[model samples]
Target: VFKGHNLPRLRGAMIGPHVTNADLLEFGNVWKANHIRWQLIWNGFPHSPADSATLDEYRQWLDGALKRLEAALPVCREAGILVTVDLHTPPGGRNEASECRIFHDREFQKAFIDIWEDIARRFADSDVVWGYDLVNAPVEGMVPDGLMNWQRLAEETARRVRAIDQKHAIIIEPAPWGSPSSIALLDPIDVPGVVYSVHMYVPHAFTHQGVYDNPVGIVYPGTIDGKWYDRNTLRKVLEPVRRFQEENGVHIYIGEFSAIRWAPADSACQYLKDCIEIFEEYGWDWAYHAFREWDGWSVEHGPDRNDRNRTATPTDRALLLRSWYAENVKPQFS
Candidate 1:
């Protein structure tokens, strides 16, 4: 536990790239979210660090992003929702095929640590800001050991942040795009108040179906791509994460987990239900992949694959989330 509460107590959803005070209040009061993964996304999809050639360009963009974050923290405090300051996009942007260039570039790596240091110094005194999610989804592709590795970068970043902010937690996700299985290989950082994070989008064939070139009709708990999957299969896939948590006495956070809105039948709802069940069973903290960010991942959208429009009526997925949210115990910030 960071303060007095249990470490696994916070539960909520990711809420930005563009967020307003209204969105913050709505997520807390209306949706019942007790926490938010405030994503400071500089380069969203279809855009990457490639768009920004120099570190100065990215820093300029981040200045505005940080301003937005500063404005939202007070609103979150009023809403009684804890916030995880997520660096959705780092200085070394990511491309369609690989992780952020920070993994391979020394300059980007230096800037990455500098960014965290700035954030730590800025928000060190805030009680509402829960943790610093070092980087979004680090994908270290072909970057050999000791050559700008994710673990090393994360530990260094944590060290810098801790030097400035000793009160808040530092969240670190394993490489290979924060895949759950990668947690098994991730060595725990020696930083105090450190938490391990994993994004669950397993059986990519299922959760990401209908996106890009992925098949359009795959369903959960059934044969898809010639493999049978049930709730047990989901549990089995997370065995490594469970082992990591138990073995190291560390906390696990499901930073992102969701199936697309267009999934056939009630599969998306069932998938979320099963995933949440497992998360609760393991006593892990989690945040849904998003909240009002994208229509495809929005629980507020209808299950009708073609609807696309945000529904006035609550959808099954939204209600399911609300049922869980009903149990949220608001953060007690001194």
Candidate 2:
């Protein structure tokens, strides 16, 4: 589907943990040059709520980052991929302990706007920028009323962008958990022409099945058991979005979704196919987080190699991804 329609069901990853720009440049076609989530959201020390540094210092820091990230854009744009400024840091990693208030804070919140304005001003002339992902994976507990702040943040970011960026899409995820049900809890932030968003790997067990301590992955494998989310589950899962959109005229994105090699390849392949059906049914834009192996850098597994799914065949893993494309990504994103 990708090769035929130029549809972009991509394979992505946070490679700052691995490669540099030149390293990413070399693997252009193999991995799409899109959505670079530079660690600007590190909300401590430099971004601390009590730091004595001036806003100019923050802007300067952002300026350096934009220049650094933009340096990688030529390669991404050339590859037909759009670069999204991904705001991956949350106020306080897990417990919704984010320093910024959900829809309340004026100063700190505006700083968030300032980041977009800076990016917009800098990238105004370039098409390499697809849009801005308005602060990824926010904690549910931190949102105004424990509602996940989806509508609130999207509306704010969209307004800021329309006033400046205007043409790019702003991405927003609904609470850190893959809760399609959370859509109903939201009120549809009034962004005129922006894509609404969500992340997947629903059963969780399936995606990070054998992951050590397993953050958000691992739906049911191991002591968790099996029976992760399938197509029927996916369709039912999206019901709230389907209903919410019908009432409010908005679209959502399955921003990130993927299962790991811990499970059987065929099952993972079928899971991808089911996810694609959900994406297609919703007319949503989605992307596979990545197509490469863990690179032996897992915190749980200690090192990458001697872990659970430590088979010695590259083809074994490679085939798993190829099968995903055929069954799901190709049909949906493409």
The top-ranked prediction according to TM-score is: 1
Model 2 quality (TM-score): 0.69
Model 1: CA > 4 A from native: 1-8, 46-52, 144-147
| Residue-level error in angstroms, candidate 2, position 15 | 5.1
Model 1 C-alpha lDDT per residue in residues 1-334, reported as the tens digit of each score = 3321343377899886777788889888887788889887865743565445689988888889899889888899888798888888888687556567787777888899898999999999998888899988888765644456887889888998999997888999888778888887789998899988999988889998978899788888799768788889889989999999988888888899999988889998899999999999988889998898888899878876678788998889999998998888887666
Residue 32 CA error for candidate 1 (Å)? 1.6
Off by over 4 Å in 2: 1-19, 22-28, 31-64, 90-106, 140-150, 176-178, 212-229, 245-247, 264-266, 291-305, 308-334
Lowest summed lDDT across 10 adjacent residues in model 2 is found at: 296-305
* TM-score of candidate 1 relative to the true fold: 0.95
Over 1-334, each residue of candidate 2 has an lDDT whose tens digit, in order, gives: 0111224443333334233655555434443333333334334321353233445565565565566677776765554444557655433223234433434444545666666677667776666655567766554444444332545656776687778865666665665444676666666566655666666666655566556565433332233344435566667767887786667666566656665644553455556667766676666665555423243322122213236453454443345434433432221121
Q: Which candidate is the best by lDDT?
A: 1
